[PDB]
Design an enzyme around this catalytic site. Structure first.
Site, short mmCIF file in Angstrom:
data_model
loop_
_atom_site.label_atom_id
_atom_site.label_comp_id
_atom_site.label_asym_id
_atom_site.label_seq_id
_atom_site.Cartn_x
_atom_site.Cartn_y
_atom_site.Cartn_z
N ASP A 100 0.80 15.03 16.03
CA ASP A 100 0.87 14.93 14.57
C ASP A 100 -0.52 14.88 13.91
OD1 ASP A 100 2.32 15.01 12.27
OD2 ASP A 100 3.26 13.04 12.49
N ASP B 141 -0.96 7.18 13.15
CA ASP B 141 0.38 7.75 13.34
C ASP B 141 0.74 8.21 14.75
OD1 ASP B 141 2.26 10.44 11.71
OD2 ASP B 141 2.87 8.75 12.99
N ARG C 13 -3.91 13.93 6.71
CA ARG C 13 -3.07 12.89 6.11
C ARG C 13 -2.77 11.79 7.13
NH1 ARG C 13 0.17 17.34 7.21
NH2 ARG C 13 1.62 16.97 8.95
N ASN C 14 -2.99 12.08 8.41
CA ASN C 14 -2.72 11.09 9.44
C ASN C 14 -3.96 10.43 10.03
OD1 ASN C 14 0.10 11.26 9.25
ND2 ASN C 14 0.13 13.12 10.52
N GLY D 115 5.30 4.73 5.53
CA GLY D 115 6.38 3.76 5.54
C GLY D 115 6.02 2.59 4.65
N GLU D 116 6.71 1.47 4.84
CA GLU D 116 6.47 0.27 4.05
C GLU D 116 5.20 -0.40 4.54
OE1 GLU D 116 8.86 2.17 4.19
OE2 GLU D 116 10.39 1.01 5.25
N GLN E 256 3.93 8.02 2.79
CA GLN E 256 5.00 8.33 3.73
C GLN E 256 4.91 7.55 5.04
OE1 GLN E 256 4.21 12.71 3.73
NE2 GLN E 256 6.20 12.88 2.72
N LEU F 239 0.80 -1.22 0.00
CA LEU F 239 0.00 0.00 0.00
C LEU F 239 0.84 1.27 0.00
CD1 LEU F 239 -2.79 -1.04 2.54
CD2 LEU F 239 -2.76 -1.26 0.05
C1 LIG Z 1 -1.67 3.32 2.56
C2 LIG Z 1 -3.07 2.80 2.60
N1 LIG Z 1 -3.53 2.40 3.78
C3 LIG Z 1 -4.76 1.85 3.88
N2 LIG Z 1 -5.24 1.43 5.09
C4 LIG Z 1 -4.62 1.43 6.31
N3 LIG Z 1 -5.18 0.95 7.44
C5 LIG Z 1 -4.31 1.01 8.62
C6 LIG Z 1 -3.09 1.46 8.29
C7 LIG Z 1 -1.88 1.59 9.15
O1 LIG Z 1 -0.94 2.17 8.60
N4 LIG Z 1 -1.83 1.13 10.40
C8 LIG Z 1 -0.78 1.40 11.21
C9 LIG Z 1 -0.83 2.52 12.04
C10 LIG Z 1 -1.99 3.48 12.00
C11 LIG Z 1 0.21 2.75 12.96
C12 LIG Z 1 1.27 1.85 13.08
C13 LIG Z 1 1.37 0.74 12.23
C14 LIG Z 1 0.34 0.54 11.30
CL1 LIG Z 1 0.52 -0.79 10.23
S1 LIG Z 1 -2.98 1.95 6.65
C15 LIG Z 1 -5.58 1.70 2.74
C16 LIG Z 1 -5.05 2.15 1.52
N5 LIG Z 1 -5.79 2.00 0.28
C17 LIG Z 1 -7.14 1.40 0.22
C18 LIG Z 1 -8.12 2.40 -0.39
N6 LIG Z 1 -7.66 2.79 -1.73
C19 LIG Z 1 -8.61 3.78 -2.26
C20 LIG Z 1 -9.99 3.23 -2.71
O2 LIG Z 1 -10.06 1.82 -2.70
C21 LIG Z 1 -6.28 3.33 -1.77
C22 LIG Z 1 -5.25 2.46 -1.02
N7 LIG Z 1 -3.79 2.70 1.47
#
Ligand SMILES: Cc1nc(Nc2ncc(C(=O)Nc3c(C)cccc3Cl)s2)cc(N2CCN(CCO)CC2)n1
Length: 278
Positions: A141, A159, A145-146, A32-33, A30, A26
């Protein structure tokens, strides 16, 4: 066997790495991975954050997890587990279907995500912040975006790498790293002083981002002139279609003196009231 409850090295947040499947990546942003995945044990979709070689120290990466182990709220991205021990460490959380709030607002069907829904998104976030405030935590933060979006316009704060449990009313960062100027309170920019009130100020900015459907704060304004402007009493104008009561709430969040800023409890009750008027 550290993974066994009898073990002395047992950690309930440590989960079996082979219990997760790494599907579509995904990243691209920013955070991260970040990867999308499945927790086979329950065929439950999950979000996974990875760590690389240089990128960042392990003690810095796990900091966010440490923070997430002590907070729990329906509007706070929930920690599900961690993968330490071997190479590429993971941080697993619930998966938010629609990604970050900022891009959501910019790509949404404005006829669906209307005045009430926008209002419903502000209330949820103020709810999560009222909980953090109540436990004497600061996020540091807060920004569109967060935040993350789920189904039914479900919004959750994410975040937590800079979040901290405070011993008092203030927390003073060091002098190294910087902070997002357009989302940072004056006292934090001038003296590097953070507190719940600095979070309140950032919440105000986040409201403006929500009201404008994802516009960048102080559009066109040079970053080096932002502080002095704020000192001369300049503040962003009311977005088109933004209720005056909601805007008056933004202004209170942007009071130059921290103590003049409302509390998250007052903010949430204020939004809860406006929202209930539906
Ligand atoms: C980058 C991204 N994140 C998505 N969901 C997330 N849920 C939880 C996430 C996460 O970061 N948790 C986390 C936190 C908060 C802290 C420490 C550690 C972690 Cl692991 S990120 C969905 C997504 N897309 C689906 C929707 N698409 C549009 C229409 O379909 C576009 C792409 N893209």
């Amino acid at each position: 066997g550290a993974m066994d409850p009898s073990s002395p090295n047992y950690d309930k947040w440590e989960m079996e790495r082979t219990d997760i499947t790494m599907k579509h990546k995904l990243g691209g942003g920013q955070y991260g991975e970040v990867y999308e995945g499945v927790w086979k044990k329950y065929s439950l979709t999950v979000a996974v954050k990875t760590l690389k070689e240089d990128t960042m120290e392990v003690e810095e990466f796990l900091k966010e997890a440490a923070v997430m182990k002590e907070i729990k709220h329906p509007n706070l991205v929930q920690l599900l587990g961690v993968c330490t021990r071997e190479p590429p460490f993971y941080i697993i959380t619930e998966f938010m279907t629609y990604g970050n709030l900022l891009d959501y607002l910019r790509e949404c069907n404005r006829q669906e995500v209307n005045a009430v829904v926008l209002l419903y998104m502000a209330t949820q976030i103020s709810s999560a912040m009222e909980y953090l405030e109540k436990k004497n935590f600061i996020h540091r933060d807060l920004a569109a975006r967060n935040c993350l979006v789920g189904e039914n316009h479900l919004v959750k704060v994410a975040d937590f790498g800079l979040s901290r449990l405070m011993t008092g009313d203030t927390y003073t960062a060091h002098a190294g790293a910087k902070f997002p100027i357009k989302w940072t309170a004056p006292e934090s920019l001038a003296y590097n002083k953070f507190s719940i009130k600095s979070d309140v100020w950032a919440f105000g900015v986040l409201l403006w981002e929500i009201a404008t459907y994802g516009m960048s704060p102080y559009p066109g304004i040079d970053l080096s002139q932002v502080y002095e402007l704020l000192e001369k009493d300049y503040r962003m104008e009311r977005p088109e279609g933004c209720p005056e009561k909601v805007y008056e709430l933004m202004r209170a969040c942007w009071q130059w003196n921290p103590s003049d800023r409302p509390s998250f409890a007052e903010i949430h009750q204020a939004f809860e009231t406006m929202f209930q008027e539906s």
